[PDB]
Structures are given as C-alpha cells and as structure tokens.
Design a protein around this nucleic acid. Structure first.
Ligand SMILES: [Mg+2]
Ligand SMILES: [Mg+2]
Ligand SMILES: [Mg+2]
Ligand SMILES: [Mg+2]
Ligand SMILES: [Mg+2]
Ligand SMILES: [Mg+2]
Ligand SMILES: [Mg+2]
Ligand SMILES: [Mg+2]
Ligand SMILES: [Mg+2]
Ligand SMILES: [Mg+2]
Ligand SMILES: [Mg+2]
Ligand SMILES: [Mg+2]
Ligand SMILES: [Mg+2]
Ligand SMILES: [Mg+2]
Ligand SMILES: [Mg+2]
Ligand SMILES: [Mg+2]
Ligand SMILES: [Mg+2]
Ligand SMILES: [Mg+2]
Ligand SMILES: [Mg+2]
Ligand SMILES: [Mg+2]
Ligand SMILES: [Mg+2]
Ligand SMILES: [Mg+2]
Ligand SMILES: [Mg+2]
Ligand SMILES: [Mg+2]
Ligand SMILES: [Mg+2]
Ligand SMILES: [Mg+2]
Ligand SMILES: [Mg+2]
Ligand SMILES: [Mg+2]
Ligand SMILES: [Mg+2]
Ligand SMILES: [Mg+2]
Ligand SMILES: [Mg+2]
Ligand SMILES: [Mg+2]
Ligand SMILES: [Mg+2]
Ligand SMILES: [Mg+2]
Ligand SMILES: [Mg+2]
Ligand SMILES: [Mg+2]
Ligand SMILES: [Mg+2]
Ligand SMILES: [Mg+2]
Ligand SMILES: [Mg+2]
Ligand SMILES: [Mg+2]
Ligand SMILES: [Mg+2]
Ligand SMILES: [Mg+2]
Ligand SMILES: [Mg+2]
Ligand SMILES: [Mg+2]
Ligand SMILES: [Mg+2]
Ligand SMILES: [Mg+2]
Lengths: 246, 338, 109
RNA sequence: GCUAAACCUAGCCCCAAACCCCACCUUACUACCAAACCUUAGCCAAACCAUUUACAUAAAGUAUAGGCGAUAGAAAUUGAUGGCGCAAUAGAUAUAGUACCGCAAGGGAAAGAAAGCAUAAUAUAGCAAGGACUAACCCCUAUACCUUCUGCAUAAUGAAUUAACUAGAAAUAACUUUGCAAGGAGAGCCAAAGCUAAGACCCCCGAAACCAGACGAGCUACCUAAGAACAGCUAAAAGAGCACACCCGUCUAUGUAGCAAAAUAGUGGGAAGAUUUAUAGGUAGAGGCGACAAACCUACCGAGCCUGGUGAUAGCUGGUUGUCCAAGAUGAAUCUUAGUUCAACUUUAAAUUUGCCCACAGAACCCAAAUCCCCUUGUAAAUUUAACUGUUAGUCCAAAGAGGAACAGCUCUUUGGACACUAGGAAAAAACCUUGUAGAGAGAGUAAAAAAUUUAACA
RNA sequence: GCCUGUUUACCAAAAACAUCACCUCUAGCAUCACCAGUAUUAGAGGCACCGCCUUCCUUAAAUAGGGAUGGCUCCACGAGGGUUCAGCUGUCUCUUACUUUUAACCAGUGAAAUUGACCUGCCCGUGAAGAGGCGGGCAUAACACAGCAAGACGAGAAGACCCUAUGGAGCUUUAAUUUAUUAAUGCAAACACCUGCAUUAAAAAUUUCGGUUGGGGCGACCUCGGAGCAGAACCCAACCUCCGAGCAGUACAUGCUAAGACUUCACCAGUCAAAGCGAACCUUUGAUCCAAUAACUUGACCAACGGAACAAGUUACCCUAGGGAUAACAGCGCAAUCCUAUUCUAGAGUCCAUAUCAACAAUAGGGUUUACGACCUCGAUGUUGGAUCAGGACAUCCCGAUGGUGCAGCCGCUAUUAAAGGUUCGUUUGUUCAACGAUUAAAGUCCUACGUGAUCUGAGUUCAGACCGGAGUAAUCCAGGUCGGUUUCUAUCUACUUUAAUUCCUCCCUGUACGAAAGGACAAGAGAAAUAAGG
C-alpha cells in the first residue's frame, strides 16, 4: 500500500480528481455528442451477404415471406427493442453476389439493396414497427404467453411518415401504383432487366403483404392465441371489432 | 517574522497620505494661498482644448468659439514677442465635448491641461530649430510641440516603453502619415540621465519634464500613487533623478541653446532647488555656465488665463485656482551660456 | 524587487540535423531570429521556422547572402561593405529523394 | 516440584417454517375522598463550504436531476428444517442486564471442566553471540529489534514478559484456462472473434468535534418557603471594636499515588450581618445561574452528562502476522508543497525490428569542458500493445556556477559518482578509495591500503 | 481602592467585582415576574462615599523610598502594594546541642511509577553532531548493607513554548449568505383578531480564515514574455541580477479547407504549414459551468491569472492531531563579528620605531559576544539570577623566579616563566553586570548544557486575574510599566562516599644599601595574628 499519505490510508480522492487542477473531463466544453441518444432509432444491419448465407444454410426459407419474425427465428439477426432497436435495415454489402429470390420485409433498405433484391426477381418492402409491435414480432411466443389480444401495429411517427409513404423506399404505406415506375427506374439505373414477377410461379407469395395495422401475416389485431389447446379466440363485440380494425 | 506588534500605523490610503504631505509642506510654502490651492486641487480640473494644426484648424476653432471658448494663446504672442488652445473664461466650468476623429481622419483637438502648454510657448520654438523632449512622454507638451510647424525636427525620449507606446498612439491619432513617417518625428526609449553622453551639444531647444509628484493626479488616483507608504524610498530619491535629468538636458543643449525645465508639482524642493542644484553640479563637474532667463513678461501676458505664484524667485509657477483650475505647472527657462 | 523572469524555454533549435530524412511539411528548425536561412525546398513560416517543402535529405551549407532589395536595412548594410566583402549565411536545403512521379502503362488501347 | 498448563458442552449465531391469592401511577409494589397529535437535525461527501450528498430479475445506472459537480436517479414494460456457523478471551452482554460503577439517564463484568520461580547466587571483558577449542570463561570477530527518516547504537518512537485475541473487504478493463463460435448467454445483454464461466486484485486502531433525544440544581450559582445559631468583654440600638463557637482561606512549612483526586499544623480575615447554616422546592445546556472570575451547573465547563446518528471524519501518528526467488531509486498543475493527478521511472505480459555506442559531414550571428546527429563497429536491446501499482519537493563527494561572508555538516541550478544494497580500506565511519551477483572449502594471486618533515655566527 | 462585603471550589482575595452617592437613557401603565407596584415609581447603563475650586532628605554606600467636565481634598478602613525608626530575634556572621518523628536492625503484613535485553567501568577520539556498549588506550576476582545525586539527553501527561492541518471550537465585527422567527410598517384577506405577501430592523443562524516570502516591521509577490545565471542541440532554480505586457495599429480573404510537423518537459492549452478551393495581386494572454443572442456569436469576473458562484479579524480561555520535515534556551557547525599573538614600521614616544604605545595592512591561533545554519532532541527537560558544591584552561589578579626599562632607592611600565595555593563584605536593583561604601596580597579572564532546580530557591521573565499607556470598530493585542500567581519524584544501573600550608603585619638586619635630599631596600631571622587543613 505504500508509505503513509492518502494512498496508504486508503483515502485518495475520487477518480478523475486531479489534485485541485480543473479536471480534464470538466475543462472540456459540453457538446451535444449524445443528446437524445436514447431516442435515436437504431436499426440492426442485415447485409445481403448475411441474408444469402442464411438462405443457403436453410435457416431462412425464401419460399415464404421473410419478415423480422423469420429472421429472428433463423437467428439471422438479434433485435433489442429495449435498446431502441426499431428493426432491421437492409445493407448493400454482398449485393454483387446475391442470387436469391426472396420476399423480404424490413424497416430500412438502401437503394442498392433494393436493387439487388429486385434484380433477383424478389420483392422488398420497408415496414414500420413501434417498439411494442417490434417486441411482439421479434419474440411472439412470450407475447402469446402473456395472454393479451394481439395489438394493432401503430403508424409511423410524423417524421418517418414520408419515408414509408415514398415508393422509392418501397414503403409499406406508399401508393402501389408507383411501385412499377420505381422498380423500372432502379432497373434502368443499375443496368439489369426487370423480371416480371407476375409470371413467376411464386407470385402470390411475393405479393403477400401484411396489413399496415397487422403484426403477424395471418393473425388480426384483437385475437388471443391459446397455445395450450391450439386455438385462436376472436372477439365478436362490435366495439372491440371496430377498435381492432381501426 | 514577528506577527503581533504593540501598535500598527493608521493605514492611510495613498490619497490621504499625499494630502497630509501637501498640507504639511505647501501650507508653509504658500501661507494664505494654500487653502485656495488646496480647494482648486481637490475640485475638478479645467481642461483646455488644443486644436490639431494637422486638421481643419479653422473649422475646429470656429466650432470651439461657437462653444464660447476662446484661444488664450492667440492673444498672447503679440505681447510676448501657430499654436491655438481654446479655454473657457475665468469662473466658467463648462466642459469641452469629447474629441472625435476629424474629416482628415485625425482627432480634431486634444483635451489637455492648458497649464501643460506654457513651457512649450516659453521654450521659444524658432523656425528650423532642432528640438528635444528628454523625458516628456505623456503626450501633452509633446503633441503641442509637434503642432507648431511643418519645418522643424523633434525628438522625444522616455525610458518607459508604455509611455512611448502612448506617444505612438497619440501620434497615429493626430499626426498624419506625412509628418509622422518623416524624420520630423523621432521617438526613442532610452535613459535621459546618460543622454548627455548619448548626444552632447546637439539640440537647440530642449524640454525636460522630469518625472514629478504630479500632485493633482496623486490626489485623484489611488493607483500607483507616488505617496504610498511603501514607495517612500523612490519618493525620496526623486530629487536626484530630477537633477540628473536636468543636467543631461543642459549637457545635450548646444552652447547658447535653450532648455525648459518643467514639473507638475508645487514643491519648492522639486521646483527651484532642482534647477539650482543642476546649475551648480553642471558648472562644477562639467564647468558649463547656465543662465536663468526671466519670464516675468510671460507671467503678465498669461495672467488673464492663469494665476501665478510670485514669491518663487526662479522659474514660474502656475498655481491652480477655482476660477482657473489649470495648474499646477512649474517651468523655468535656462540658456546655456557656454 | 526583481519580478518576472520565470518564463520557460521555448524548446527551439534544429529539429532535423544534417542527413536526416524529412517528409514534406516537417519542421526542420525553429528559431527566434534568422540563425539558419531557408535553402532549396525549405519554407519559412510567420515565426521564422523552417519546414521541408519536399521529401528528402536535410543538408546545411554556407552561401553568399543577397537580401531582397525591398529589405532596406539589409541593403544599406550591404551598401556599407567594402568591395571585396561578401556576406555569408547558413542555409538549410532538402535534397528531394523520390521523383515527382512516373509514367505507367494504364490501357493498351 | 511449585505455580500452572490442558479439556467439552453450557449455551449461542445465521436460516427455514410458523404470525407471538394480595400489592402496585401517592414517596410504585401503599385496602378505603369531590390529560396526546406538530418537517428531524447534524455528522459525513463535495478533498474547505454556503445549493447539493448523507435518515425478484430486466428495462438501467437508461430517461432525468445536479455549485450540470460531488453525486442523486425513475417509470412505462417484464414476471417471480438446515449449517465447508462458534465452542467458555469464541458464540449472545449474559452463569446476568446480575455483581459492580453512576444522583440520574446510563455503563456493565468475570467465571465451569508458557512466563515466573525452586531444585542450583556469584568470577576480570562488555547487544552476551559466533568462529572455535581438549576445555564453560579466557583468544579473535561482532554498534539490539521495530517504526520514522537523506541518514539512527543513537542520548528519536514502541516494547517487562508469557498465553490467547488483534488488521487487504470489490469493481471497470485486462490476462490465464475451459465451453460454444459469427455467434454466445437458461429471455433482458454483448457481438466487425465474439460471447459465456471461473481464477487473481483494493487493511486495523485513534481525535478534538457536530447534531437529536433523554438525564442531571442531594455539589455548586442564584432564588422561594418556613426554621435555627451567634460565648465573654468593650460598647450602646452599630453592614461597631477585641475575641469563642461558627464561616473563610492571608502567609509559611509539611504533604505531592498524600490522611486528602486540594489535606494537615501554625498563622491569619469575618464573627448581629450584604452573616453562617439544616430542611424542602425552583431555574437545564447556546440554556440556566453569575457582587464578570469565562465563575459555577455531581471531582476533568470558552459551554454538562448519557444514549443515538457512529465503525463520525482524520491529506495526521501508530500498527499491518508463513517460506523462498526474481525485477526494482530522486518535471507540470494544484486553497498546493505533511496530499494528490498527469508525466518520468518501475513491474508484468504481448507484438515485431531495430536500439545504444558511434567516427566523418553537419548545427549563428550578435558579442571552456563539452553537447546534439549517425555510416560502421562492439553489442542485444529498443520501440510498440495491454494492465499497473509504488517511488515521485533526498544526502554527501568531484566539477561549472548563483546567493551568503570566495562562512557553514548553509541555501539554490547543472554534469557525474556514491549512499539509501555486498564486502575490503581510510581509527571509529551512509556519501572518500578498492569491489561488486550471492553457496561450501582448514587452498591461491591480488585491489585499495602505513605521512612527512628541524631549520638564523661572521669578513 | 472610600468604607463592611464578593471573586477565579483545586496556583491569583487584589488595585478586579459589588457598594451607599451621583449622572444618563427608557416607560403614563394593572390581574403569573416587574407588581397586586404607578415618575419621590420601575427597568437599563455609566461612575464611584464624601467635600473644595475650574536637585534635596533618608544610608557609610539608596536602579529603593519621600520632597521640591477637569484640577484637587485620603475621614476611616485594608491578611492590598511600597518605605522607615525602635525593638526583637538562629534570618544571618556560623552553626551547635538535645527531644520527638522519620530513620537503621529484628518480627508481621506488604504497594506504585518503572522495566527491549543487559555479562550495565574510566579517558581521549568518533558518530543522527553529548557513548557503559564504536576506535585507541587505561582499569578490572565475586558478592551484600548504608549514603549521594554528576550521568543514565533519569521517571512521571503522545510535557511547557513554536510551527503545520484546505483539524476543531470560542469571541468580535463595516467577512460572506440568509430572515425561517419575532417587532414594526405597507399591500392584499376576513369586517380588535388573524392569514398571505413584501420592506426595514432586532435578534440571531451557518460558514470561512489562500499561498511564497519578511526577526527590530507598518510590507512585497502570485499570470505571461525578453536577457544573464544556463558560453556550443534541447532543458535547466532562486527571497537570484535586470527589463517588459495585460494591447494597440492595420486591414476587413486579416477567408474555407487540408498533407506533414513543432510544442514550454504531463494534460489542458499553444505554434508552423505544402497542396486545394475562394477573394485578391497583417506585426500576449483566462478553462468549465452559467448566462445573453434566432443563430452566427457575445459577456462577468475568475490578476490567488488551471479559475471555490457568493465568507474577515481574533483566541494567553483555548482544544485535537502531529511536527525536531519547523522557531526560542541549550548542543553542534561557522568565524562575519569578537578576542589574542606575531610581521611592517606610518607614526607618536622632548630627538629616539621597537622602554612604552600605535595607523593602513599581512599572517596565524581561539571559540568567551553579537549573528548565521536548521543537523539531535517537541511520545513531561522553561529560562535568568542567587544558594550549595565546585572540576578544569592560562591568555596570571595576588603570592614565586627572571630579562629590559625613559628602573639611582622606593616605585612603577613592559616581557619570559609559574596554575601549588588564594582570589572580601555591604547599599540600590531579580539582576548577571554596573555605580557606590569599606577593604584586600589580590578582589583575574574564561570553559564546564551561558557547570550545577531527580540538591535548593522562583525575585525578573513565562500560564489562567487586574490596572496604566498605546494599537484596534470590536473581539482582542502589546519586545512597555505595576500588583498576584501549585517547582512532583520511595535511586534500578553507572560514578562517587577518609588522596610536606598560605598570606599578611610588626620587629632584627636598619631610617643600613641606595639617594643631594625627599624618601627607602635587599637577602636572612624572630614574634604576632589571620585563614586553610587535621585534631
Ligand atoms: Mg507507518
Ligand atoms: Mg506519499
Ligand atoms: Mg529566463
Ligand atoms: Mg467536506
Ligand atoms: Mg416498474
Ligand atoms: Mg463470553
Ligand atoms: Mg517453565
Ligand atoms: Mg532507543
Ligand atoms: Mg516522534
Ligand atoms: Mg517504553
Ligand atoms: Mg439545592
Ligand atoms: Mg456576642
Ligand atoms: Mg462587626
Ligand atoms: Mg456571589
Ligand atoms: Mg474580567
Ligand atoms: Mg480573561
Ligand atoms: Mg462534571
Ligand atoms: Mg478512521
Ligand atoms: Mg535482485
Ligand atoms: Mg484553486
Ligand atoms: Mg497535506
Ligand atoms: Mg476595597
Ligand atoms: Mg484558587
Ligand atoms: Mg469562596
Ligand atoms: Mg489564594
Ligand atoms: Mg532594602
Ligand atoms: Mg475586607
Ligand atoms: Mg520488615
Ligand atoms: Mg564522547
Ligand atoms: Mg545507553
Ligand atoms: Mg546502593
Ligand atoms: Mg506531541
Ligand atoms: Mg509536449
Ligand atoms: Mg490560486
Ligand atoms: Mg494557480
Ligand atoms: Mg536543509
Ligand atoms: Mg522518551
Ligand atoms: Mg604563561
Ligand atoms: Mg556557549
Ligand atoms: Mg514570579
Ligand atoms: Mg494578564
Ligand atoms: Mg510585562
Ligand atoms: Mg511580579
Ligand atoms: Mg498574596
Ligand atoms: Mg524540587
Ligand atoms: Mg533522594
């Protein structure tokens, strides 16, 4: 422990104290590096490399729509809603070697990632999730054990509304009339011939899109999932039905 | 060190200490004039306005006359035989508006103690005469000398770089580039005591404004008050420095040349003993004779604007008065006969 | 009665002795007044510090000093010299090491 | 062979479970007469202090608050009988809240089943031993230990001695070893080889204090009620004289662990008064009371005592317990110089590649010794990465200087050496000289290493 | 000081406090003090009864004593503080005898502080600077018992005093921050009382006491920069020697960006800068937070200039924790100062250097003063004087023996040698000293922890009380004057406890030598005393 002084006595000043000189961590001006950090939205990246790897190893089935639930179940991505994760962002990394036809739903998508997905004959849509809906989507089984009716998926905040109503982002709230134009624009820009997915034998699968207020593909808001006896209780009260449809 | 003492001195402020010194000395010196001098010193100071000859001199003079000030200098040279300083009448306390940059780009006038202009007018600046200011670098008399002619050469010296920088500031403000850049203006920061060796019998007209007790400012400002108790040693050695500087000026002036010893103090010690001791020292250690020239005509000429103490045998003393709070100013004209 | 005078040293002087390899921008020497003058491929800052303008080897030489004519005091000093006298100064040069580029084959059109 | 030594259960600790005749508030333990509720403060941290701090899991030490600093700090949401205990200085304080101490509040025990001596004093000389020796001593060598210091035999601290008890608690990040691995983890969290688990690492005693709430005016200060005492003489209705009882405490001596935590003997002051004194009652702690001495308030009152906050705090002092080896030594800021943080140094582990020495060439005008720089060469180290304590306002010697007095075992800066490390020498000996890397030897060669000097006739 | 009284229980009994008397200020009034009172009353403060006006003497000697609203007047009193006549006395010169206690031995009973271990000597030297323990010498069988108090820096309280701590506490304030609480008012609120909000006070409450330097003062400094110390890369202190600055002038690309570098030994901060873009064709001070601005940007101090947002004096009534890392006495260094001795003669000395004295200086030596250093001791050692007892040096004051002399004799002056012995009593003063009185053969200079308080004393000084004078707003303070004021120790160890006189005067020689006289010897001897030692 040394010899005498505060250090042998065990009473040396706090960490960061500099003997009275204005400490380094206080003499530096305050700057908004981390202002609002806990309210910034975070999106876990999903590179096309990782997506192709998952598809190749069979952990993600491209024959069915790929949403956040399927990604998590295949363990392709780890979402932490409590840490302000708002979902998954597609990432162009691996685009030049992506060769999978997939119907994938994500929260953000880069232009190049959209281009790769569409060139392979697939469909990509950016879908928003509030923190609660995101938690339920990422871990549905715990939610089903909570014994609560499936809630409605909330709409994007005002700042995010334009993003999800824009067709260039394949927003899930965007006018579907503008989608062919945007897809043709990407095909022209990136020099590939747009494949007419309507002719594909999986066109129905590629078209399936959950309703903007729907969390799970085949389950409607307000239903209760009784896993114990493999049943789905549906409300019939007019007020409840109106609420869960609104 | 001994912390506890039986008795400690009253701890006067420097202003009060200066007042006590003045009361114990000038009271004896002046008898019944001391109360008037005291009240004048303690009251506000009357500032004269010296127009800048390097600016719109006629326009500025017109503006000042509109402000009702009159040029006391103008109606003095006539009897005494470019300088124009406007001062208000006796008793008037009107201030002068703060100086502002003029049309030419230089300050129209300098607000300075009208008493700190008599030494300049008594030195007798003749055209084409080389002029020295041994230590006078508060501006003032220096700028007055500058605003005398465009056919004259002048050097100004002061040990203090701060005061030299102040001279430079006022020069850039008032003197134009033409004169300031020209050799007409030569400023230096050297010791005047050795100026006799630095230059000897070179200058024709010298002005020696030795550092003084500056009684009015001593009573006014506490900062750097010469009468602070600690600086008694410097106060005591002031006479030696004053004598040395006057001797250096008398050595530097040419034979037959003229010097003006100047002071901003009432002290007979710093006024007449300085000049007499300088004469003695410079006539013995250097065998050079100097004659004190009479300024009684100068006194009568400027009696209207200033009040002068007559009992002073050598030199002239402008004492402050409530009617004309212009003093103090002691000045003595000395011609080097050898 | 003597105050002040506690200023620390400026740590000036040569930073690169002769033969030292110097990259562009490296300060070669910091001086208060011109002890060493800039030579070839050596620049001068506001504060009269010498820095390398090219990447090379630092050399110190003695060369005749001919000041800029607009340097009036130096010109007068020269004007007062005798006919045979020539002023000299110590100059710092950077002998550039690499060539400033090479021509490469890019495409065989 | 005495004193003594020892012993094992009396009980206790932490969990789990379970919700546990008569007398007596008057002076308590006495048979029987006409009214509660109301913010804690402060210590402490902030290196003072003044706002402030200080009375399931996960989200998350997040949002927030804050001399925006010390630090404080959510919620939405999630859903959840046993003993690697003690065993009579331990474990409860406990055989007992007893004895005992205190007026009181209050404090609060102990215990039951070797040392020291004696047998047998002692012999020149000496840290009490060691080398030895035929032999105890005699011979030679040898300046106790701890702590604090530049440096201690030091005439600096602590220790009579024995037994028992008595002092390093933990994170962040690392490193090591497993597991699994672009994933790890038994939800939450982390992840651009990570994640998970484990291993390793942060003392003891001590103030004067502050505040809260009690307890104290059986001493003492003053006061209230109702009592009592004051001979004799002199003087006459007395804050009168002398002088008993009584009260006090001037001076001296004694005593000073005492007869006494303020006494004794003599001497002395008052002794009908503002006197002394018994009884009961009152005033309570920032308060009372005070013929103000900072006097007194239960022996220690410039602010009582007890309990609690409290294991207060202490940059200050002291202490900090097995063996063995290894590496290891002299700037800046700071209410700061008795401290700390950063640097430098130091230690460990790791990476890869130059490191030191170093000639020539080279480094200024103004107005010496040397230094810097690096091809070789002698060498094997250096840099970087990770982690990190501690030392960090020293001494003397040689040298260049400054201050002082061309004093100081004096005070400063610089280069170097030595000391704080072994040994030999210079008498003893930190700092001068020789010399170092460790063991055994009843071998050998050496190093430094011992002061020298004696002196007045005269043509 | 009027008086009698009171007070620091346990170091101060006093001049301090009170006190009648007097003065000043405040109050016009009842049902719990004042007060069951009412201005001749009550409360508080000051002041001090009362009354009247505005160099000599003492001694023999005398640092003592007495006398030549304000200014005086002391009646009485006093364990107050000084001085004195006379007396008295063992206070003393100068101590002795006896009794009792204690004591020592015998018997019984039987502690305490203390204690590293000790097989515990002296001298010199050394050393953390003071040695029983180390070096060199000397001494040395072993043990009781009784004394002593020189040492064991002896034992007692983490002594006294001094310094430090971002340790306490007390006191005072024009230190800082508050007015919660009361008292006044004002504004609302209820129609005297009460609530809320403001302002001003009173009373208090909380908190702080920067740093470095300075012994005889009346402060200076604290940040930055230039020069020397520090000569030649860099770097280098100081109460070190000097100097300078807290910006201005200029322009308004004095813009934006960016390789690579420097760096005040850390960080913070601070510098330089190619290329590029854009216009054109510059030479020092300060952080964070906080505020203000729409923002760009800007501000206050933070000069104790790495910056507490806002806090001073004082403490001897003090306390705690420490410090010999830091003062005073003392020890130890040093020798400026001081003292001594030689060399030189300037010179004085009637001339005359050297009978004697001595300048400017030089060279040695000492460790007696005044200082300097901060090395030992701050985990019970005040200091000065005095008493007692002294050990030692000789640089000799007397006594002894000599040389010279400006020594005829006596006398001196000077020098050499000599440390065996000796070296007074009084007045003032606490005094060491000093002055004075009277002596003496002489009344020596010093060291010994300015020897010696476990032997004594406490008069000065030093602690708690109080005055005078002074400083300070006050609390308080003071190198000053004064009155008062607790001095513990039973001895374990070392050491020690029985080791051939000196002077003076008288006389003889002898009023002899010598000398003109005056004066006046030696050497030798006798007698008286006195002291010292031993009986
Ligand atoms: Mg320790
Ligand atoms: Mg330390
Ligand atoms: Mg310097
Ligand atoms: Mg604190
Ligand atoms: Mg919750
Ligand atoms: Mg027990
Ligand atoms: Mg035994
Ligand atoms: Mg010891
Ligand atoms: Mg100690
Ligand atoms: Mg002890
Ligand atoms: Mg009572
Ligand atoms: Mg009677
Ligand atoms: Mg009576
Ligand atoms: Mg009383
Ligand atoms: Mg008092
Ligand atoms: Mg007192
Ligand atoms: Mg008590
Ligand atoms: Mg503690
Ligand atoms: Mg080792
Ligand atoms: Mg500070
Ligand atoms: Mg400290
Ligand atoms: Mg009295
Ligand atoms: Mg008493
Ligand atoms: Mg009493
Ligand atoms: Mg008494
Ligand atoms: Mg007497
Ligand atoms: Mg009395
Ligand atoms: Mg007995
Ligand atoms: Mg000795
Ligand atoms: Mg000893
Ligand atoms: Mg004995
Ligand atoms: Mg102590
Ligand atoms: Mg640096
Ligand atoms: Mg500061
Ligand atoms: Mg500072
Ligand atoms: Mg020292
Ligand atoms: Mg001791
Ligand atoms: Mg002799
Ligand atoms: Mg002495
Ligand atoms: Mg006394
Ligand atoms: Mg006193
Ligand atoms: Mg006194
Ligand atoms: Mg006295
Ligand atoms: Mg007395
Ligand atoms: Mg005694
Ligand atoms: Mg005894």
């Amino acid at each position: 422990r040394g010899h005498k002084g505060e250090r042998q006595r065990g009473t040396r000043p706090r960490l960061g104290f500099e003997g009275g000189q204005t400490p380094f961590y206080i003499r530096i001006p305050k700057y908004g590096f981390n202002e609002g950090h806990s309210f910034r939205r975070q999106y876990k990246p999903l590179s096309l490399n990782r997506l192709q790897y998952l598809i190749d190893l069979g952990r993600v089935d491209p024959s069915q729509p790929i949403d956040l639930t399927q990604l998590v179940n295949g363990r392709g991505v780890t979402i932490q809603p409590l840490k302000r994760d708002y979902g998954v962002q597609l990432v162009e990394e691996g685009a030049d070697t992506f060769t999978a036809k997939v119907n994938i739903e994500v929260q953000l998508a880069s232009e190049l990632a959209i281009a790769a997905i569409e060139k392979n004959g697939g469909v990509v849509t950016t879908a928003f999730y509030d923190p609660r809906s995101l938690d339920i989507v990422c871990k549905p089984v715990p939610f089903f054990l909570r014994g609560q009716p499936i809630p409605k998926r909330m709409l994007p905040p005002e700042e995010l509304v334009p993003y999800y109503t824009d067709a260039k982002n394949r927003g899930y709230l965007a006018d579907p009339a503008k989608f062919p134009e945007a897809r043709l624009e990407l095909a022209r820009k990136y020099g590939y011939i747009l494949p007419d997915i309507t002719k594909d034998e999986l066109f129905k699968m590629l078209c399936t899109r959950k309703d903007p207020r729907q969390i799970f593909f085949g389950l409607a808001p307000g239903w209760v999932v009784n896993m114990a006896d493999k049943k789905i209780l549906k409300p019939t009260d007019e007020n409840l039905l109106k609420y869960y449809t609104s | 060190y001994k912390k506890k003492w039986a008795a400690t001195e009253p701890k006067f402020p420097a202003v009060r200490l200066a007042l006590q010194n003045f009361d114990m000395t000038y009271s004896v010196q002046f008898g019944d004039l001391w109360p008037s001098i005291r009240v004048s010193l303690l009251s506000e100071q009357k500032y004269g306005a010296l127009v800048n000859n390097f600016a719109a001199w006629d326009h500025v003079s017109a503006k000042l006359e509109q402000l009702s000030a009159k040029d006391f200098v103008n109606e003095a040279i006539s009897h005494w035989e470019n300088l124009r300083c406007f001062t208000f009448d006796r008793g008037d306390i009107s201030r002068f508006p703060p100086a502002r940059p003029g049309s030419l780009g230089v300050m129209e006038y300098y607000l300075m103690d009208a008493a700190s202009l008599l030494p300049v007018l008594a030195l007798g600046l003749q055209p084409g005469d080389i002029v020295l200011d041994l230590c006078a670098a508060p501006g003032g008399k220096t700028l007055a000398l500058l605003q005398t002619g465009c056919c004259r050469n002048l050097a100004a010296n002061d040990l203090s770089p701060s005061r030299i920088a102040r001279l430079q500031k006022i020069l850039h403000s008032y003197v134009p580039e033409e004169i300031r850049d020209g050799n007409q203006v030569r400023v230096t920061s050297w010791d005047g005591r050795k100026w006799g060796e630095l230059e000897g019998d070179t200058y024709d007209r010298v002005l020696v404004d030795v550092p003084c007790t500056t009684d009015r400012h001593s009573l006014h400002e506490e900062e750097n008050n010469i009468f602070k108790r600690s600086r008694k040693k410097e106060r005591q050695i002031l006479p030696v420095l004053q004598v040395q500087l006057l001797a250096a000026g008398l050595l530097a002036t040419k034979p037959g040349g003229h010097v003006v010893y100047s002071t901003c103090s009432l002290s007979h010690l710093q006024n007449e003993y300085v000049v007499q001791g300088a004469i003695e020292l410079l006539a013995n250690q250097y065998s050079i004779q100097v004659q004190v020239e009479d300024l009684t005509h100068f006194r009568r000429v400027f009696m209207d604007t200033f009040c002068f103490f007559s009992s002073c045998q050598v030199g002239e003393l402008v004492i402050p008065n409530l009617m004309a709070n212009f003093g103090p100013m002691y000045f003595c004209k000395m011609r080097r006969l050898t | 009665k003597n105050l002040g005078g506690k200023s620390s040293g400026r740590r000036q002087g040569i930073k690169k002795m002769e033969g030292h390899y110097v990259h562009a921008g490296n300060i070669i020497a910091t001086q208060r007044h011109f002890r060493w003058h800039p030579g070839a491929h050596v620049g001068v800052g506001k504060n009269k510090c010498l820095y390398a303008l090219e990447e090379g080897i630092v050399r110190y030489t003695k060369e005749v000093y001919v000041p800029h004519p607009r340097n009036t005091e130096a010109v007068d000093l020269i004007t007062r010299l005798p006919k045979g006298a020539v002023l000299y100064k110590t100059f710092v040069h950077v002998v550039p090491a690499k060539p400033e580029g090479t021509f490469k084959l890019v495409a065989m059109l």
